[PDB]
Amino acid sequence: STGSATTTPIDSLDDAYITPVQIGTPAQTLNLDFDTGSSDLWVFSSETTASEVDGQTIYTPSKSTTAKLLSGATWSISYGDGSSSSGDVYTDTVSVGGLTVTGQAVESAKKVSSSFTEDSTIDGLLGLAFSTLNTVSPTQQKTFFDNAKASLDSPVFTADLGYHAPGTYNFGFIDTTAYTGSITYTAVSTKQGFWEWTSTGYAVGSGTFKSTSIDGIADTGTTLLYLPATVVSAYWAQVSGAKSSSSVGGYVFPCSATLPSFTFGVGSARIVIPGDYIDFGPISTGSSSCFGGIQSSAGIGINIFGDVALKAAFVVFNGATTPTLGFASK
C-alpha cells in the first residue's frame, strides 16, 4: 500500500501545514497538523468543551459505525510552545491520502489550550515521531505510521513542504520526480523518541562552511529553525540592525533588510535555505521590525530543524529497523 496527501499552509507565513484526513464510517474529514515531533493523533470532537471550540471541524464518534471507545484510556500532552490538550480515546478507521489503517487510536479532546482554540484552521494533530512518546495511559498507543508500516510498500514517509505553497506527504514510497540530485541519508537516534540526527555544520550566506556537529530533531510541527546561540549569533551578525529582543521573544531585524541564506550540512551534502524563507514579517501589523526565522535553542534544550529548514528539502523519514533521515534538494 501507499498514500499521498497534499499539505497546505494555514496562513501567509507558513506557520503550520494542514493535511486532510478521513476518520470513521462514513468518512469525517478533518484537517490535521502532521507533526514529526510528537506521537499522538488527537482531534477536536463532540466531547471538546464547547467554549474551547471556535470554528474547528469536530470528529463525532457516535456518527461513526466503526468507532469504539477504548475503555479506560486517557491522554494528556504538552508541547514545546506551552500548548496542551487532553481527553479520552476511540479506535476507528483512519485514511490518509488513500492509505487506510483500521483500529487506529483517535484521541478525542475534552480540553484544549487557548492557542488551539484560536487556530480555527487546525482540527487536531497527527503525530509521526516514535510511538514511545505516545501519551495514552494505561496502554500506550501506536502512531498512524507505525500501524501502517505492515501494509506499506516500503517503511517510509516523506515530507515535501512548500514555501508559500502546498506540498505533499507520501507514505510507503519515494517519489523520484519530487527532488533533484541524490538523497543523502544520515543516522537517526530514537533514544529520545524523536527523528534525532546530527548535522555536519553550517554556512551563513556566501561565507565559508563551518564543520561542527549539531544534534537536533526533524520536526514538521515546529515553524522555525532553532539552533545553538553561537550559530544564530553568527547568522544575525550579517544583518544590519538585527538584535535579540527580550520584549518580542527572539531575534528581530529591520524589515528593510535583505536576509542572507543559511546552509546546513547533511553528511557531505548541503541544504540551502533561501534568505526569503527566514523572513517572518512584521512583529505586529504595520511594524517596521520583522521577526526572524532562525532563533536560539538555548532556552529549549534541543535544536529543532522545523519547517523553515525542512521546506528547503525533500525529506525522507525512513522507519526501517535501522531508521535514517534523507535530505535532497528540490
Ligand X SMILES: Cn1cnc(C[C@H](N)C(=O)O)c1
Element (DSSP H or E) covering residue 114: helix 114-118
- Helix/strand/coil for 233: helix
Question: How many residues in total does the chain contain?
Answer: 330
Nearest to 124 by CA among 216, 47, 43: 43
Smaller CB separation from ligand X, 141 or 200:
141
Smaller CB separation from ligand X, 250 or 260:
250
**How far is Cα of residue 134 from the mean position of the Cα atoms in its chain?**
16
Smaller CB separation from ligand X, 109 or 152:
109
DSSP E strand boundaries for 152-278: 156-160, 167-171, 180-187, 196-204, 210-218, 225-227, 243-245, 250-254, 262-266, 269-273
Chain position carrying cell 547533511: 266
Q: In 10 A of CB 268, how many CB atoms?
A: 7
CB of 208 to ligand X, least distance (A): 30
Q: Please identify which of the residues 38, 45, 131, 199 carries the catalytic annotation.
A: 199
CB of 222 to ligand X, least distance (A): 4
Residue 175 among the catalytic residues: no
Residue 199 among the catalytic residues: yes
Residue 76 burial (10 A CB sphere; 0-12, 13-18, 19+) = middle
Q: Which residues pair with 295 in a beta bridge?
A: 226
Cis upstream peptide for 138 (omega within 30°): yes
Smaller CB separation from ligand X, 183 or 309:
309
Residue 297, C-alpha cell as written in the block: 535553542
Smaller CB separation from ligand X, 17 or 171:
17
CB of 16 to ligand X, least distance (A): 6
Q: Please identify which of the residues 14, 35, 123, 160 carries the catalytic annotation.
A: 35
- Per DSSP, 137 falls in state B
**What is the side-by-side strand order in the sheet with 279-282?**
243-245, 250-254, 289-292, 279-282
CB of 266 to ligand X, least distance (A): 22
State the residues that interact with ligand X by CB under 6 A. 35, 37-38, 79-81, 83, 125, 221-223, 306
Smaller CB separation from ligand X, 89 or 126:
126
CB of 78 to ligand X, least distance (A): 9
CB of 122 to ligand X, least distance (A): 8
Residues known to be catalytic: 35, 199
